[PDB]
Scaffold this active site. Structure first.
Site, PDB file in Angstrom:
ATOM      1  N   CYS A  36       0.834  -1.239   0.000  1.00 22.02           N
ATOM      2  CA  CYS A  36       0.000   0.000   0.000  1.00 22.02           C
ATOM      3  C   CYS A  36       0.857   1.274   0.000  1.00 22.02           C
ATOM      4  O   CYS A  36       0.559   2.170  -0.820  1.00 22.02           O
ATOM      5  CB  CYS A  36      -1.016   0.006   1.137  1.00 22.02           C
ATOM      6  N   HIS A  83      -2.948   1.220   6.798  1.00 22.26           N
ATOM      7  CA  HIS A  83      -3.169   1.222   5.333  1.00 22.26           C
ATOM      8  C   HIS A  83      -3.070   2.659   4.812  1.00 22.26           C
ATOM      9  O   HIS A  83      -3.204   3.616   5.617  1.00 22.26           O
ATOM     10  CB  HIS A  83      -4.514   0.545   5.018  1.00 22.26           C
ATOM     11  N   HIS A  95      -5.479   1.887  -4.443  1.00 24.96           N
ATOM     12  CA  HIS A  95      -4.696   1.315  -3.326  1.00 24.96           C
ATOM     13  C   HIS A  95      -4.324  -0.131  -3.633  1.00 24.96           C
ATOM     14  O   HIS A  95      -5.025  -0.780  -4.450  1.00 24.96           O
ATOM     15  CB  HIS A  95      -5.458   1.505  -2.006  1.00 24.96           C
TER      16      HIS A  95
END
Lengths: 125, 126
Positions: A36, A83, A95
């Site tokens: 990520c 994240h 993402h």
């Protein structure tokens, strides 16, 4: 909070969007595979701006953005670095998820309501 | 010299150009407020960290020569000696600033070669 946006912000968003379909790989930060923070880091590096390698570090750079003022290129950090995603407009973010789905575009709202994670920072490098 | 290894700047310019789809077309334009054909390619590469000639005719000489079958996202396609320029984005598609009625679009390279009256005079990899 609607800080000054630049070509590097919109360009990072375009580079991230072009990476949709790329594989997810633990520790990856190139088209061969992204994690990520490796996707957001790569997108900004390719737009000429270096940001920290970790989602947690990315939470401290640039200017604070309020949710309703998000613009393409804004970095959305989740649950203090669990994240990170990059806003691409229309309520969507790009993402690197997991190896099963790779780099995708999906709803900020769906992730906030159902992932168990919360937005802890929205940054505009 | 010919079909040399591509860089992140090449794929990044293609991604930036694709993200500009829907932008207005404007004579002499080189920003998201409005682009002409060479203003879009110049802007995409400047945002990817490379300075290229501002005009389509000058872009015919930038970087390295590429053959049609070896095109990769980011390759600049110059038409009829500078009459038009576009950027290859893969899958036989190119992104380009057409005219005020349609703005920046993605469309087929083969549809343009076969029906526009224009021919590819240069394919360059900055």
């Amino acid at each position: 909070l609607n800080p000054a946006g630049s070509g590097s912000n919109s360009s990072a968003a375009g580079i991230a969007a072009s990476m949709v379909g790329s594989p997810y790989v633990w520790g990856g930060s190139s088209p061969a595979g992204f994690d990520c923070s490796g996707l957001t880091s790569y997108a900004y590096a390719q737009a000429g701006i270096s940001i920290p390698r970790t989602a947690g570090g990315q939470a401290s750079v640039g200017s604070a953005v309020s949710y309703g003022n998000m613009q393409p290129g804004d970095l959305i950090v989740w649950s203090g670095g669990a994240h990170v995603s990059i806003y691409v407009g229309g309520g969507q973010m790009v993402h690197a998820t997991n190896p099963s789905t790779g780099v995708i575009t999906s709803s900020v709202s769906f992730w906030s309501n159902n992932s168990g994670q919360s937005i802890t920072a929205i940054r505009r490098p």
